[PDB]
Design a protein around this ligand. Structure first.
Ligand SMILES: [Mg+2]
Ligand SMILES: [Mg+2]
Ligand SMILES: [Mg+2]
Ligand SMILES: [Mg+2]
Ligand SMILES: [Mg+2]
Ligand SMILES: [Mg+2]
Ligand SMILES: [Mg+2]
Ligand SMILES: [Mg+2]
Ligand SMILES: [Mg+2]
Ligand SMILES: [Mg+2]
Ligand SMILES: [Mg+2]
Ligand SMILES: [Zn+2]
Lengths: 50, 59
RNA sequence: AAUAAAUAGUCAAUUAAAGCAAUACGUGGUGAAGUGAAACAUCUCAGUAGCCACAGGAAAAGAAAACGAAUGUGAUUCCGUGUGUAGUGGCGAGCGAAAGCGGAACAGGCCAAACUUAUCAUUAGAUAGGGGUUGUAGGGCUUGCAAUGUGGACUUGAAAA
RNA sequence: CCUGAGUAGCUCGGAAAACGUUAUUUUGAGUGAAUCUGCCCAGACCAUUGGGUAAGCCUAAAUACUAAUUAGUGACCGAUA
RNA sequence: UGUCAGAGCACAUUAAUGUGUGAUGGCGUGCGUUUUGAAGUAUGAGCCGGCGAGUUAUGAUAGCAAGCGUUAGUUAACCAGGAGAUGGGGAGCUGUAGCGAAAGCGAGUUUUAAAAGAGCGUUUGUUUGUUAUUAUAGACCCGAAACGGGUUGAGCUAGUC
RNA sequence: AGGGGUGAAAUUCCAAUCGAAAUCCGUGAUAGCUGGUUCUCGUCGAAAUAGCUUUAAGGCUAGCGUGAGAUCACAAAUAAG
RNA sequence: UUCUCGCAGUCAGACAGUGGGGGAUAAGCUUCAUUGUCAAGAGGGGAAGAGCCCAGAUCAUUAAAUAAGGUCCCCAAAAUA
RNA sequence: UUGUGGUAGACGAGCGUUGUAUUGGAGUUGAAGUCAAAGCGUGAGCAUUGGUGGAUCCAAUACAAGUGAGAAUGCCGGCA
RNA sequence: GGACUGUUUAACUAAAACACAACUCUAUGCCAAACCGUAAGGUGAUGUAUAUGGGGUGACACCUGCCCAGUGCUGGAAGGU
RNA sequence: AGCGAAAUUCCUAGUCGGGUAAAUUCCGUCCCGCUUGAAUGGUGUAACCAUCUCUUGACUGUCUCGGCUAUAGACUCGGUGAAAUCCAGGUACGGGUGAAGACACCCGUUAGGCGCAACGGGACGGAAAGACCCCGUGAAGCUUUACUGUAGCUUAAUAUUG
RNA sequence: CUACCCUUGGUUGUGUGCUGUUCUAAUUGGUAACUGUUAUCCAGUUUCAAGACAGUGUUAGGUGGGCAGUUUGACUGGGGCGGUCGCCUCCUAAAAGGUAACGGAGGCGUACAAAGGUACCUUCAGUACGGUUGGAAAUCGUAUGUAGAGUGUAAUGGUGUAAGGGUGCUUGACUGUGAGACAUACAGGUCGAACAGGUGAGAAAUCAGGUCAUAGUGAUCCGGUGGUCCAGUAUGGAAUGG
């Protein structure tokens, strides 16, 4: 297999909410989206977590 | 008649039969499944009536 | 006796056993495999069989450095239940208590050591006595009061059933 | 003043205990304390609270078993049993 | 290799459209087993008689019947007893409120921000008898080659002395 | 003296048996594998397929039989449109 | 023939008709879909045949009409054109 | 009125055996067992008479099982 | 073919197999090494490298070439793990 | 190096010569030795061999080719008296059919009942739960750089201990 | 001038162990002598050689078929060697769905922060005439054509104003759920209206819980990582679990 997935975590409360897929070999940039966070109850910026 | 030890730890028994169980595919590989599949499998469920005979006498 | 003394050794006297079996029961040492796991090594069969030592009329165990969650039980053993539970297990096959509770039976005693006595080339650190036996801590050491008695895990006689 | 020292622990390998090693319990090797203001215990561990005093001995009863002696029983066999 | 018809013959009864044999016509490739299928050139049985294979203990669920019943039902061990039914014995067992991993809440509760939604619940008992099936014990019966443990054998034979 | 012995070597010989003696015991070893499984009458009446299986001569579940009970009209069948 | 509950059995199939694969429009071959039969099913036709055609055995009758097939004799039954 | 072929296999009703219990009862005027016979039943099975034999046994209702044999290259005995 | 004489698969093989004389290699400095035994003990050996155990070839004559990368064996002395 | 169709060579019954009337075997010889080969030794070698392999003299019933005789049986009489096998049997032949090769079935054919000596075609004769093959989550023995462990052998810390 | 901290060297001093000597009393002896003793074992005394090494107990590395217990697959037109072992699409597959074979062809073990979502605009490839570098074929305008183009990729299905190409804005490649169905032995898979929270695009309706659809993946146990309106073997914590 290839372990291409990755995990997004909120920055205010630092939980590890979301899971997605990203191909490092092309876009080395760290993803920074903004999605719903269950603890914070609103759309917060999520950034990647190892 | 001793209760099967590796069963009494997986099939909690509710009122009026209806053996209760957890769902599989929840321990290992998150990304290969989808969010819909994961939140459908978190909720526990009953045992098919076919295996109810095999399990009731197994408890 | 080597070696002077001494010990080893040798000779004599007295008292015990050595063995058998009830193919059974008990303890203790050592200890498999077949089989199950639908194969198999962890595991189970199993601390089973067998071999061996040791008795006994029964043995072993035993009078708390305990249980364990409470204004609590109060040696051990054995039966039912707790329960096929809490747990443990390549968490597979499988294994399986300790409390608590109801019961059969019921008893708890005694040394070592402090201190003291007599004697040992008293170098005793030893021999024989007294004394003392433990947890709401006890005993010894100094000083008084009350005691003459229950009690048996027990010696000899007599009488009776 | 006394209250059981190569002892309780600690470490290395193992095991009894329901537990495949873990508090408790034992130990082949090594090390090794304290003394009522003490020591151990209440599933790693520390403090508080509470329980008990090891490291010495002895113990009938209930329990297991019957080749044996006596009396007797059997919805047990009745000479291929 | 008998059967359905059927003559002749000889007798005479568990009194019956009777009994024994049966020239002659029609018809006709055994029994268990295992197999797609066997008369089988597939296998088992020489013949007769006897022996011989789904039981038992302890628990689970289901059906049927009985006792007892809505704060129900029910005893085990043990004790007394004709090696008795039974009486005592409520310690426990099931049911009486579920849900939840759990503290907890309670005819509601878990998930959930959610009191929506969904999951699960918002009463139908128990003890015995008997039967079917099932679990642990060899568990219908017979059947290995083998595995492990203890002993007995070099009077044949191999070697050495 | 046997998970041994002996072997001028052959897997020889070890009490008419030897690729690891003989008999006793665990032991009624285990055998998805052959064979056998004993009285009668009545009612009903199959499958020999799919999925998975260190599975393919076996096993589990579904499918098909039977028994007990319900559904009795909108369910299931049989003809035409 | 749907639903619930108890109880199993079965998982080596065969052949004939039909539509195809593999095969060589070869196999009583093999693998499938379908209709039957046999298995688990006797009688009559087939001379004799498990699987074809007709049929689907409660038992007795020394009764009558039929289905497939068939009517010189074996072998029951027909003649005319 | 509709049915009644049938292996595996489910379900129902039953016969027989051995013994125990209570209830009736037969037996040296001959019991069981054993052979023979020209009986009765839907079946498992059941009577009647006679010879032999020489002391236990039959029926009714429950109960409990070492309970029902043609096959196991079955075991034992006998005989071809 | 084997040098020979011999031994062998009792009870289907006596042979071209085994043995053997001789050759070489290796181990072994005596409480030898190898070996049986758990150890004691014992053989080796009341022996001492002109001796003993092991592997391989197999009288006698002539010959026994090449490779030390891999495996094995012996030695190494600084380093690395 | 040697030797070489070999106890080794598949094509290969190689080629060639000798033996032989005739020679897949035999002796010698050449060498594309499929893959010979130097102590798992190579090449020679007198003697020896219950060894193997080929040619040959004598020799003979081995044989053209079969015959004769004598005994012991066999066969008959008297006496004692087994075995394995076996569903019951009163157990024909041809063609066909059939679980595919028939004493029984179908359609024809042939045949008085019963022994005795013989012989072996058949009754897939009898004796052996097929040794081969396959299957079993079967066994044992053996192997190894298969796995896991281990007796031994060796190395270091620690006690014995200065 | 009085202090604290680095690089490098000498010193009296300890403390460790490291190699290396010497000595002996532990210890060893299958050196000798003596006695118990008429004794080749043995015990004791002395001598002789070794000497804190060796041997020995525990602990730990290495080599170790000398030895032990075991596995060493299945399908399979007999078995072996060969091939294959899950998933996806077509044909076989007999016009619903399904349907076997060591039957016929081929693919996957993903890819994209845009190739997602939304608003807006736009719609083939090819051929012919015409045009410097420039050629068969680049691009340019024109017509013609009804898909032969495109659709990330295998085949099939579907799609020409689309599900294809360009642009602006974003991240719904959401959280919590789920009535009702499909196909299914079980496990699992698939589709999804509708509801609450809080968003994106858009004037708004509406759309959005990943892509045009169909593969793109693997149970349980064990252990780890992040959060926690859970428990914490008497109590408070913790360890350890959930
Ligand atoms: Mg505690
Ligand atoms: Mg029968
Ligand atoms: Mg036969
Ligand atoms: Mg040789
Ligand atoms: Mg040679
Ligand atoms: Mg005679
Ligand atoms: Mg034969
Ligand atoms: Mg798009
Ligand atoms: Mg896409
Ligand atoms: Mg895609
Ligand atoms: Mg606490
Ligand atoms: Zn947040």
């Amino acid at each position: 297999a290839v372990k291409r997935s990755t995990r997004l975590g909120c920055n205010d409360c630092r939980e590890i909410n979301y899971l997605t897929f990203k191909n490092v070999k092309k876009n080395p940039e760290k993803l920074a989206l903004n999605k719903f966070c269950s603890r914070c109850r609103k759309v917060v910026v999520h950034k990647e977590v190892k | 008649m001793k209760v099967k030890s590796a069963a009494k730890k997986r099939f909690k028994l509710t009122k009026s039969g209806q053996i209760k169980r957890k769902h599989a595919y929840t321990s290992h590989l998150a990304p290969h499944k989808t969010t819909k599949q994961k939140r459908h499998l978190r909720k526990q469920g009953t045992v098919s009536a076919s295996d109810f005979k095999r399990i009731g006498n197994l408890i």
